[PDB]
């Protein structure tokens, strides 16, 4: 009964993109009733690799696929489409520093900015995943003129359900009766997971667990969980990364559960004093394909502290582009 | 809610598992309602890895998963177990025949089948994904007396689903519109796909393609599709074989839509002449665990031919697993 929405992925043949692609065909994205037209994205030596992607897709006989592309051009990938997940950003190099990485993403983000602008729908959703998320999403909405910033997201989810699943392990509950976790900041490891508002069954997360826990065990493990992610397995986490990005555009299209919220890295407009325009994860309802940021939320010193160190990573990091002329 | 069930799965940390336990756990295999409890076996070697799947399961925050647990003991991983998915399968290093092969495979599925057979529920639906797939259910049922061995069953639907792609792009009719696919046999290049009573809009197949296109490229395309995949992508087409994976257990638990059927090998009784004992794929329709093979179709010598054909290599399988004294 609903008209098909075009969906773009770039890094399509990547690790990501295989563990993503198929749960958004089968409709665990944005619904069992909403079919989708993916439009895949990949560099010109990626492209064979994306034909295998595309035959597997085919393979599994999708009855919500009610599309598929493979190109190497954002114009042709990002044509009218309603959704796009930024995965594809700049490989890790040898001899390569920091700063020249972040050149690389600029040229990828500066045009991919660009493409959106020109060919995607006017209200088109961005989730950035491609490294590094915040910043990204930052050169991209600043190099698409006509665009809804708000419209460019980053991604912090998996940051999200990491924490929630320490607390449910700690406290001994289901990960189901957890809700209002937040992590605020950028995507790296300054971000901020927050249990001052977080509930386990209704009950503050902090008559279950002491502030030492907190600090000393729930903050660093969240914050190493991709590591050790890649210890044990011997390859990154794109299963869980998949499932999040999942998550994210799925809650923001759909809707988030009444009295819970989650977390999104969107443009700031200086929601509990954040810097404008740094893409900063919040603590964000949605409903209709609209985020709004939680605001009111009572900020000690412990979280303040945290929330400001995550922030001026982040305006490093956008000094460094706009010094790169990036933006 | 229903009460969990647990679901076995072995090979836990190979490539199929990774592209399978996730969809699993997001309930997209017995139903969004069906809470499950994931118990997975691997080798000693592989634990350590299977610990890093864990952690990217509870980082998905599932809240059907009620249970996950990771064992290296199929005692342990199949005790109460409702559902058993046998992926995990003898590994084809250097300096090994085919005998060779056969000696750990029977040996794998020998004590995986006693093990059912002694921890399971009575019940337990088994779904052998690991190659030779019908030769290892053989040796796993034949080794689990006390139970039902048309529950052990092995997977032919990405080779079913991969037909009916081909079907849909030929005629460019949406997969969605083909029903009626057939894949008999084994799992093998010796497979075969069915399109005698398969209909594309409700319309005969071959009333839409000829036998021409059908002998000298459908066929050969279905069978040399997972090569054709590893060719382009450089690896094996996990993702699609996991869909697969679920699709057979889930049309099994839940049911075959109405005036459409789906392939599934399972333990022979005769039907269509094929000898007694052997698993076969076969034309199947399925209602709340429990299946039926289509019996009463008219078959032509075209299918005869090759039914008979794949039919003698299982035969074959049968007999030289039966000389090495596994069954
Ligand atoms: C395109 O895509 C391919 C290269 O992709 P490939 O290397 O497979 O990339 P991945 O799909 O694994 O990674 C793509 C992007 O997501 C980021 N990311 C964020 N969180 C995670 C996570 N938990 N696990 C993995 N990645 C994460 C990566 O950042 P980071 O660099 O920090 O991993 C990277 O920028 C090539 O084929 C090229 O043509
Ligand atoms: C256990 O399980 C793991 C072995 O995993 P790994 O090597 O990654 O294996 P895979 O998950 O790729 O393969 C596991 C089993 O499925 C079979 N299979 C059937 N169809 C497919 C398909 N389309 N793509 C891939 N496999 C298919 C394989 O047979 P085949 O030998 O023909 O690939 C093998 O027996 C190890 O961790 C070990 O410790």
Chains 1, 2 share one sequence.
Not at 63 to 88: C, H, I, Q, S, W
Not at 271 to 282: L, Q
Request: contains cysteine; negative net charge.
């Amino acid at each position: 009964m609903k008209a098909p929405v075009r969906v773009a992925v770039t890094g399509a043949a990547g690790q990501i993109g295989y563990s993503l692609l198929f749960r958004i065909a089968a409709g665990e994205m944005l619904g069992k009733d909403q079919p989708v037209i993916l439009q895949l994205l990949e560099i010109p030596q990626a492209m064979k690799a994306l034909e295998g992607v595309v035959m597997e897709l085919e393979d599994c006989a999708f009855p919500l696929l009610a599309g598929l592309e493979a190109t190497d051009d954002p114009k042709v990938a990002f044509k009218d489409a309603d959704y796009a997940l930024l995965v594809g950003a700049a490989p890790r190099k040898a001899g390569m520093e920091r700063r020249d990485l972040l050149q690389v993403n600029g040229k990828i983000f500066t045009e991919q900015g660009r493409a959106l602008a020109e060919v995607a729908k006017k209200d088109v959703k961005v989730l950035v995943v491609g490294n590094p998320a915040n910043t990204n999403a930052l050169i991209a909405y600043k190099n698409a003129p006509g665009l809804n910033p708000r419209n460019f997201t980053a991604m912090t989810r998996l940051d999200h359900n990491r924490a929630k699943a320490q607390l449910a392990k700690k406290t001994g509950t289901g990960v189901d009766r957890i809700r209002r976790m937040t992590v605020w900041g950028n995507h790296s490891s300054t971000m901020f997971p927050d249990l001052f508002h977080a509930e386990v069954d209704g009950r503050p997360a902090l008559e279950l667990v002491d502030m030492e826990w907190y600090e000393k065990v729930f903050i660093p493990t969240v914050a190493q969980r991709g590591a050790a992610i890649i210890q044990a397995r011997g390859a990154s986490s794109a299963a869980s990364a998949a499932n999040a990005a999942i998550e994210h555009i799925r809650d923001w299209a759909l809707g988030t559960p009444e009295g819970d919220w989650v977390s999104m890295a969107v443009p700031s407009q200086g929601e509990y004093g954040i810097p404008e325009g740094i893409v900063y994860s919040f603590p964000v309802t949605a409903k209709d394909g609209a985020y709004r940021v939680v605001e009111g939320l009572e900020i000690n010193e412990f979280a303040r502290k945290r929330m400001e160190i995550t922030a001026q990573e982040l305006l490093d990091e956008m000094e460094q582009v706009k010094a790169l002329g990036l933006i």
